[PDB]
Specification:
This protein has eight helices and seven strands. With 245 residues, the protein is α/β, with parallel strands linked by helices. The chain has a single domain (1-245), classed as 3-Layer(aba) Sandwich (Rossmann fold). The longest helix has 17 residues, at 63-79. The termini are far apart.
Length: 245
């Protein structure tokens, strides 16, 4: 477990912004970045506030702060002189990718298993606890110590869950503003979201250029699953299909 840090793989002129999922971090898009970098693409991956640190901090942040991190990520590349910027995000990152799509100039959009349907706050929170549990286990903490820490954790309500539902709904509601070439990626039997969200995106954006690929043997965190290699190739071919300079 290497300490979660933002990464910047500088290479050619073509830049790609990589956004991770809720509860995840830059490691979830690190292998994708390294691959693109090996193909001459400059990549940058920020870490959302409350992420890449002990679970407790997560409750103190929502989409508002994460959106600020996303925009700072875009700005991070713009300030570096990079003019053409494509964006690729995982799950929540895919929602922020689409939003960026109609907020600033984007060369291309890759959404990987982005939700367009909302889950109950109870469900979302279950995922949060399961995330904290696993993070505690990865800390080398004894089982007993884990169960104690997890008790104090539930002691702090998470207001963020509701803002997340709203973010999802708002973006879906603005899909018709997206014109940038879009590549929709979806795990056919995604265990965390309704895979149909892939159809929502593809069918509702206004992009004259768009494609959708279904991965039959993958789970939600598709970047870390067994079809990763093909996924890398498919994204590369899409980026290569864009104009750039």
């Amino acid at each position: 477990i290497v300490p979660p840090k933002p990464f910047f793989f500088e290479a050619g002129e073509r830049a790609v912004l990589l956004l991770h999922g809720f509860t995840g971090n830059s490691a979830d898009v690190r292998m994708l970045g390294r691959f693109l970098e090996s193909k001459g693409y400059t990549c940058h991956a920020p870490i959302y506030s409350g992420h890449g640190v002990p679970p407790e901090a997560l409750t103190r942040f929502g989409p508002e702060a994460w959106w600020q991190d996303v925009m700072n990520g875009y700005e991070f590349l713009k300030n570096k002189g990079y003019e053409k910027i494509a964006v690729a995000g995982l799950s929540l990152g895919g929602v922020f990718s689409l939003k960026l799509g109609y907020t600033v100039p984007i060369e291309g959009i890759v959404t990987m298993c982005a939700p367009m349907y909302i889950k109950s706050e109870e469900t979302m929170y279950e995922g949060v606890l399961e995330y904290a549990r696993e993070y505690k286990k990865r800390e080398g903490k004894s089982e007993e110590q884990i169960e104690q820490e997890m008790e104090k954790f539930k002691q702090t309500p998470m207001l963020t869950l509701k803002a997340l539902q709203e973010l999802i709904a708002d973006v879906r509601d603005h899909l018709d503003l997206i014109y940038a070439p879009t590549f929709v990626v979806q795990a056919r039997h995604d265990e965390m979201i309704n895979p149909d969200s892939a159809n929502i995106i593809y069918n509702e954006i206004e992009s004259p250029v768009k494609q959708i690929k279904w991965y039959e043997q993958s789970g939600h965190v598709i970047t870390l699953d067994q079809e990763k290699d093909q996924l890398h190739e498919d994204i590369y071919a899409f980026l290569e299909s864009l104009d750039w300079l």
